[PDB]
Predict the 3D structure of the following.
Amino acid sequence: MTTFDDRERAHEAKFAHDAELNFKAEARRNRLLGEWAAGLLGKTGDDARAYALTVVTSDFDEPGDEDVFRKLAADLEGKADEETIRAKMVELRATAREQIISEI
């Protein structure tokens, strides 16, 4: 009865016309970071998937806020160095578009 159908995806040239399919890769930078911490925290399957679906802010650019580092170094206590957090998510600017163009 419902008014929806969302089906397979079809990104054919869409990354330089459309918003909707662009948007995911346009951002992505923080969407994949719970999918990192998941495994380290022992989360797998839906335990990973659901956890990943509550990890987005895009913190830690210039000093003035800094909470994600503070929270991760507690949550991930024993599984990430300070530098292991602060060096990682730096590069994911590239990995963000990459993982979409991988898992099309």
